[PDB]
Structure 1
Amino acid sequence: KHNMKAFLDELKAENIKKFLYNFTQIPHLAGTEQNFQLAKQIQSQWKEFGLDSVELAHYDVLLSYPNKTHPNYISIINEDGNEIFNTSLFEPPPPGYDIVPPFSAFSPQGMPEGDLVYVNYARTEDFFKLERDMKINCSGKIVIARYGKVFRGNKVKNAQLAGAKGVILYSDPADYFAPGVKSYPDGWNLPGGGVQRGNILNLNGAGDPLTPGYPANEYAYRRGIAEAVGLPSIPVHPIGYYDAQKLLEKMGGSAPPDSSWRGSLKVPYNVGPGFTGNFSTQKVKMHIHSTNEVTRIYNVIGTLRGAVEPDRYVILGGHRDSWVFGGIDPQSGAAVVHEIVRSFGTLKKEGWRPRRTILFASWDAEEFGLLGSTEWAEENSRLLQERGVAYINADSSIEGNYTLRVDCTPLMYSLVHNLTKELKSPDEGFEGKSLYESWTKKSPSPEFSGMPRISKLGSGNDFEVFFQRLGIASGRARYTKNNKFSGYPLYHSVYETYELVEKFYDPMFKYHLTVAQVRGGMVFELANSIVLPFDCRDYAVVLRKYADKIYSISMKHPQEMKTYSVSFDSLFSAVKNFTEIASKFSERLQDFDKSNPIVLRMMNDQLMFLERAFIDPLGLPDRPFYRHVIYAPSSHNKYAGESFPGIYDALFDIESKVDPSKAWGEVKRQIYVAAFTVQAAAETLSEVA
């Protein structure tokens, strides 16, 4: 037969290993010739594998690159203007190895000099502690912050609003060196010369900074750089912990407020400002000369037309561009997509086609702000909004070898639970056990016994435009470690190679195979199930949890809720209604005359448009491209999903607002929008007439 099992069995660990090797021999930086050539290779191979059509979609978008003849670096400078210490101009390359040196993409140019302030992880609460409790002023200071806990662009935005004139980011061994494991090349730890590259823009979903709302095509009109979206106003640069030790060792001023501010280096972790008495006249000086330039990028888009519902799209997408070799990020995911394409193409050659159309994407410029996925979705938004069933992401397949990590819409919970019960666990000690069994044991749900944890979708990857802008049901799955938002030690460093993976992560490629089964199996069921595999009742369950949670946040302020008559009754009413209507729709879905394709499709359309109904066409406050009312990327950490974001942000730090009447008025406004949207979504599941 040609069923899911036939699909799954075709997938081979050996093939994933060969593709991973093939994709990781040279760098594939966005906008470079090497990445265009890999695009053309993937396009050819997907054609050979059996897809009906495979095209390149290109765009001209703002990218950022160091100046090859004018390198970026940081100095300690003495009173006479002598640079007495300089940070590294490049990471020591690994054994046997156009490697872009470490930099912060989209940093403006500058050579600011000044006194350092150490700001821990540069989180909102870290800046609250500094400014409110310690009374330390960052204005005109250079801030130094350790990577970890939140997206780096949130750190830079926080530093800018605190008045900093520059930001230095570094990797502390506390966050990036696991006890008892060796530094690369002899283990998976970050060496002291290692550095994490990364974008520091805060685009809030806009895509190419120059063309928000519209694809960056040949005739696009572009904002002038001065009006560009999300560009930092202060220079930024990343360094390793050997270099950080040199900058931090002389720090004076106030001691760290407590131990959660101290990393693992042999330094006091004094907050500053500036250096201890003897060195009080030395300053820190950044030299940043990178340039932003409009550059062509290329997405590969493959189509396998559906036999019955060709106008319904199930999309599997992940990026192809890497900072350097991309041994984990993204090629461990791209190799998995490649093998999934190969397997579906093998069925197709034997005469099978999926029920619905499957689209496969190799996105470009993910590392520069999700630019390739976003521009393509801007170009195709009408098709996606009326035809998009689901989006399954496929960045790094492994970031560890402990257990599965799934983040997805509630609509896909049942699908994921069911599929993982049918798959074998790759884990040591769980042989002959299901993946559901090993996953639930290793990553228990905080709410339910005998259920695994599944997290919310925020941003930090290519699903963002599909889920947060367009309201297409989305999910992702990967293998992870036992530091959730911080990354594995070699993240975005030159050391992230094929050898790292083959030696230290997944020598048998069994975790890669397990992830290929989860991702491919989801795409299979979405594209082939007669009734779409979504359970609206799972949304009802989480909506009640989110409503209890936001209510509980508000109830920290009982006096104000009394004064301003702040009621959550409308929201709990809407949640109750959703729960009632979803229960009845599910009954009908099980009852409906199963011989009737129009009833089936009406019902499939109700299922497909349910995620769509949580979209507000006006967007969230000051974030027009985040339009989902139930989830958004956290305003404090793009990598984290936040629930009832519009109410959450209205409540955040509200006791500090100068006009409480206005602030609480806006809380009430957001409760109204949320209740209304929950009820309207419920009403899409009512009988249609």
Structure 2
Amino acid sequence: NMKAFLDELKAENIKKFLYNFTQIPHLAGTEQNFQLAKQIQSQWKEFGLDSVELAHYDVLLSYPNKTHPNYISIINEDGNEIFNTSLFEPPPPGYENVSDIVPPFSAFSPQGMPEGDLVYVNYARTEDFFKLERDMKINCSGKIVIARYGKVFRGNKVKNAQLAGAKGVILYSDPADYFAPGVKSYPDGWNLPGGGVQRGNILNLNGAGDPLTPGYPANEYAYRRGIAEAVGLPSIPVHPIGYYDAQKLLEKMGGSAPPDSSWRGSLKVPYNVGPGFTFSTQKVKMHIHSTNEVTRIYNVIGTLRGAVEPDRYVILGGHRDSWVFGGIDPQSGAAVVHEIVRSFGTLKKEGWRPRRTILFASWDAEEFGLLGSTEWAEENSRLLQERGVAYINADSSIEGNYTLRVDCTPLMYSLVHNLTKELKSPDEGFEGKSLYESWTKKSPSPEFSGMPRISKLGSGNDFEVFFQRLGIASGRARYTKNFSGYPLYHSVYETYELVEKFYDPMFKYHLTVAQVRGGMVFELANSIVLPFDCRDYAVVLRKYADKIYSISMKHPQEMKTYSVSFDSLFSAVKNFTEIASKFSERLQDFDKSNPIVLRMMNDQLMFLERAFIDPLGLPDRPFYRHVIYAPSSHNKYAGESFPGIYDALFDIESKVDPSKAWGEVKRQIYVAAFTVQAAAETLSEVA
């Protein structure tokens, strides 16, 4: 039963697994990552799984040149390189020994050696560039942009920059965002040293997976696009730096004041916007020599065969590749999955099987754009779309230690509420209380009433292809602090010791996340009726219809002129509410003894997420096919609701053909109303 499963999970095992996974770097595409894959595969096998395979793909990755390193220089009027950024981060204590730690770089940067004047853009958000090209009249064309990490996925920044005319982008971590007051720099606390740099890919894939093979798995005979038709590649050079190198680049900055305090970070510089220095006369020069190359990656796929519904799949998945040691990102999640597997494997050895098939993935090349999960799902899309019950992600278990952070489909809200009431809170001062209670006290619902917050799914992690492309019900759960990443994110300093010393010394937060993650997978794979509640979707559809309506209503004159009505969407939502309500009644009133009727009802619950998929995709985003949710076009990490309408409405005041534009709003309202109505009809009596 469930308690047997939950009781078999040990904090000390997680600790032991995390330590094992963090001793050397496991960069995607390296032999070391391959060996960790082989090792996971052997162990998941010894743990009891019925089968464990490696699935590999040949995908575009990116790597710095070993003998021609990347850096940024201030040059002078003659071409003397006055200042030079780091070539590497100062390795932490006792790892000065590291074989090779990849130096900081922006994965998928083109090669280049541009120079020019600097313009500071804050976080390089859409609103930042609006304030700058619209209010301030500064002009980024031909400039090198310099932006701080935080707020939004760094891919959006590069795209915003690229589109505003920039010839290069420099990213850095500012202590305002990456140094929490009163805590020390690593190795003596969990803050980011002025020499720490955040690695990370800067693609805009929009769900495509491998850049060269959109639509189809990068298998042995894959046909690939030439790199010039590749998906998501930035066209200007980009490089990240720490805040020491940053001060050096920022302190000589001229032009206009920062437009206000929200543009100014913590270093002792003015945070002038530029362009150029006070100093005229010197320029910034970038040196980028990273190369893109097709490289083999490996997913580990374990299978625990279901006793009754083997042709129904509950998937627990998270990635194995790290930028360096992956002390938090991903091995604190990977060590949790290892212990979940060990625990299910234990029950199986004593002769239990779950009701449905459970699938366990160790994904590769996630850091490079969710490539392993995506290629695997393109290869197995027909199985997934007819057999896929749910997907539970398992990246970083902790990014803090204040409370639970849950993002999931509405179908799993009730499941998550019930599971957490059955779990002990590991929180100081809530001993003998449930996780539900601490989580609700600490992160209260905005909606209300006495409920916790649960957020929408966007992207930036491996659930993306399962939810956004395929319409498989998905959730994730981790411990969090009070979109920027904790301070030591994607740095050489994110190590086992960072976690053992400063994050979770007892491994008690890991154990909690293992219980929430393994708990969901257990209920999903074993409850006789799928634990989804379609009425929960009815409720959020109404909130999102209100929301998108309110946004349109900021423009009453155009709504009159063009006859923009939301009547069809509200009507659809009202029908989905009534039909879901009747479906719940039938679900309460039938005999679980009749298997075929059970299967029919479970198939309705199962295909309901699926009903929100449009096979034509969203406008310009063929791999984002869900109509209710998509990643924000301004921030991959953030979930947006009614994305088609949201984007047709965004900055609509600026389109030059208002009636073309409002026409497309109307078209999107129609697609949404229709999809919500069609989804609802999946829950009607079937004949």
Deviations, residues 427-455 of structure 1 (Å, cap 9, x unaligned): 00000000000000000000112100000
Shift of 1:646: 0.2
Gaps of 5+ in 2: none
Distance 1:535 1:449 in 2: 19
Q: Give the corresponding residue for 2:201.
A: 199
The residue matched to 1:85 in structure 2 has which SS?
A: strand
CA shift at 1:389, angstroms?
A: 0.1
Q: Normalising to structure 1: TM-score of the pair? A: 0.99
* Alignment-derived partner of residue 523 in structure 1: 521
Instruction: Measure how far apart 1:535 and its partner are.
Output: 0.1
- Deviation per CA, 1:493-513: give whole Å up to 9, x if none: 000000000000000000000
- Secondary structure of the structure 2 residue equivalent to 1:222: coil
1:593 offset after TM fit, Å?
Answer: 2.2
Partner of 2:276: 274
Distance 2:195 2:529 in 1: 53
The Cα shift of 1:594 comes to 2.3
Q: 2:559 and 2:244 mapped to 1: Cα distance?
A: 51
State the Cα deviation string for residues 371-430 of structure 1 (Å, max 9, x = none).
000000000000000000000000000000000000000000000000000000000000
CA distance in 2, matches of 1:244, 1:570: 52
Counterpart residue number, 1:422? 422
* Cα distance, 1:90 vs structure 2: 0.1
2:56 alignment partner in structure 1: 58
What is the rounded CA distance, in whole Å, between the counterparts of 2:250 and 2:426 in structure 1?
A: 43
Secondary structure of residue in 1 paired with 2:203: coil
Q: Return the alpha-carbon distance in structure 1 between the equivalents of residues 356 and 545 of structure 2.
A: 35
Which residue is 2:230 aligned to?
228
**Following TM superposition, by how much is the alpha carbon of 1:288 offset from its aligned partner in structure 2, in angstroms?**
0.2
Equivalents in 2 of 1:47, 1:397: separation in Å? 24
Task: Quote how far apart the aligned CAs of 1:126 are.
Answer: 0.3
**What SS does the corresponding residue of 1:294 show, helix, strand or coil?**
strand
Distance 1:419 1:581 in 2: 27
CA distance in 1, matches of 2:288, 2:172: 16
Q: Cα distance, 1:592 vs. partner? A: 1.0
Q: Give, in angstroms, the shift of residue 321 of structure 1.
A: 0.1
Match of 1:457 in 2: 457
Distance 1:516 1:133 in 2: 49
SS in 1 for 2:490: coil
2:682 match: secondary structure: helix
Corresponding residue for residue 495 of structure 1:
493
Measured in 1, the distance between the counterparts of 2:668 and 2:419 equals: 37
- Residues matched between the structures, number: 683
Equivalence map 1:295-314=2 (5 Å): 295-314=295-314
For 1:230-252, what per-residue CA distance to the aligned partner results, in whole angstroms no more than 9, with x for missing partners? 00000000000000000000000
Of residues 90, 102, 105, the one that matches 1:100 is 102
Please show how residues 463-502 of structure 1 align to structure 2 within 5 Å.
463-481=463-481, 485-502=483-500
CA distance in 2, matches of 1:574, 1:255: 50
The offset of 1:317, in angstroms, is 0.2
How much has 1:221 moved relative to structure 2?
0.5
Distance 1:168 1:230 in 2: 19
Q: What is the CA-CA distance between 1:365 and the residue it aligns to?
A: 0.2
Cα displacement string for residues 447-487 of structure 1 (whole angstroms, at most 9, x for unaligned residues): 11210000000000000000000000000000000xx8000
Kindly state the Cα deviation for residue 516 of structure 1 after the two structures are TM-superposed. 0.1
Measured against aligned partners, the alpha-carbon deviations of 1:41-71 in whole angstroms (never above 9, x if no partner) come to: 0000000000000000000000000000000
Scaled by the length of structure 2, the TM-score of the pair is 0.99
Indicate the SS of the match to 1:685.
coil
Deviations 1:593-641 (A, max 9, x none): 2221111110000000000000000000000000000000000000000
Cα distance between partner residues in 1 of 2:383 and 2:679: 21
Counterparts of 2:581 and 2:28 in 1: how far apart (Å)? 47
Paired residue secondary structure (2:73): strand
**C-alpha offsets along residues 271-294 of structure 1, whole Å, 9 cap, x if unaligned?**
000100xx0100000000000000
Shift in Å at residue 35 of structure 1?
0.2
Q: Within 5 Å, which residues of 2 pair with 1:99-138?
A: 99-138=101-140
Please give the secondary structure, in 2, of the residue aligned with 1:380: helix
Tell me the distance in 2 between the aligned counterparts of 1:179 and 1:594: 57
Say which SS state the counterpart of residue 201 (structure 1) adopts: coil
In 1, Cα distance between equivalents of 2:276 and 2:407: 42
1:628 counterpart residue number? 626
How far has the Cα of 1:84 moved from its partner? 0.1
Instruction: Give 3-state SS (helix, strand or coil) of 2:584's partner.
Output: helix
Task: Determine the C-alpha separation between the residues in 2 that align with 1:460 and 1:454.
Answer: 17
Residues 83-141 of structure 1: CA deviation (Å, up to 9, x unaligned): 00000000000000010000000000000000000000000000000000000000000
Deviations 1:527-569 (A, max 9, x none): 0000000000000000000000000000000000011000000
Cα distance between partner residues in 1 of 2:449 and 2:179: 33
Q: 2: distance between equivalents of 1:501 and 1:525?
A: 30
- 2:629 and 2:75 mapped to 1: Cα distance? 46
1:154 aligns with 2:156: yes
How far residue 39 of structure 1 moved from its aligned partner, in angstroms, is 0.1
Map 1:561-600 to 2 at 5 A. Answer: 561-600=559-598
Query: Which ranges of structure 1 fall in alignment gaps of 5 or more residues?
Result: none
SS in 2 for 1:647: helix
Q: Once the 2 structures are TM-superposed, how far is the Cα of residue 187 of structure 1 from its aligned partner? A: 0.1
In structure 2, what is the Cα distance between the partners aligned to 1:301 and 1:27? 22
Helix, strand or coil at the partner of 1:437: helix
Instruction: Report percent identity of matched pairs.
Output: 100
User: CA-to-partner distance for each residue in 1:354-383, whole Å, 9 max, x for gaps?
Assistant: 000000000000000000000000000000
CA shift, 1:334, in A, is 0.2
Partners of 1:662 and 1:134 in 2: CA distance: 30
d(CA) in 1 for partners of 2:271 and 2:561? 44
- The one-character-per-residue Cα deviations of 1:654-679 (angstroms, maximum 9, x if unpaired) are 00110000000000000000000000
Distance 2:593 2:613 in 1: 33
1:259 corresponds to: 261
**What SS does the aligned partner of 1:594 have?**
coil
1 CA distance for matches of 2:479 and 2:45?
A: 29
Q: Deviations over 1:11-56 (max 9, x none)?
A: 0000000000000000000000000000000000000000000000
Q: Matches of 1:83 and 1:674 in 2, distance apart?
A: 56
What is the CA–CA distance in structure 1 between the aligned matches of 2:234 and 2:331, rounded to whole Å?
Answer: 29
Following the alignment from structure 1 to structure 2, what is the Cα–Cα distance between the partners of residues 221 and 645? 32
SS in 2 for 1:404: strand
Q: How many angstroms apart in 2 are the aligned matches of 1:176 and 1:594?
A: 53
Query: Offset at 1:521?
Result: 0.2
- Which segment drifts farther, 292-301 or 587-596? 587-596
Aligned residue among 625, 635, 638 for 2:636: 638
Give the Cα separation in 2 of the matches to 1:79 and 1:381: 57
State the Cα distance separating 1:332 from its structure 2 match.
0.1
Following the alignment from structure 1 to structure 2, what is the Cα–Cα distance between the partners of residues 574 and 109? 51
Question: In structure 1, how many angstroms separate the alpha carbons of the residues matched to 2:249 and 2:81?
Answer: 13
Q: In 2, Cα distance between the equivalents of 1:592 and 1:569? A: 35
Residue 287 of structure 2 is matched in structure 1 by 287
CA–CA distance in 1 between the matches of 2:193 and 2:442? 29
Q: What is the CA-CA distance between 1:687 and the residue it aligns to? A: 0.2
CA distance in 1, matches of 2:11, 2:286: 46
Separation in structure 1 between the aligned mates of residue 76 and residue 471 of structure 2, nearest angstrom: 55
CA deviation string 1:257-276 (max 9, x = no partner): 00000000000000000100
Q: Judge which range, 484-493 or 47-56, deviates more.
A: 484-493
How far, CA to CA, are the matches of 1:584 and 1:650 in structure 2?
A: 34
C-alpha distance in 2, partners of 1:233/1:62?
16
Offset of residue 167 of structure 1: 0.1
CA displacement 1:142-169 (0-9 Å, x = unmatched): 0000000000000000000000000000
- Whole-Å separation in 2 of the counterparts to 1:365 and 1:330: 11
Q: CA deviation at 1:685?
A: 0.1
Runs of 4+ in structure 1 off by over 4 angstroms are: none
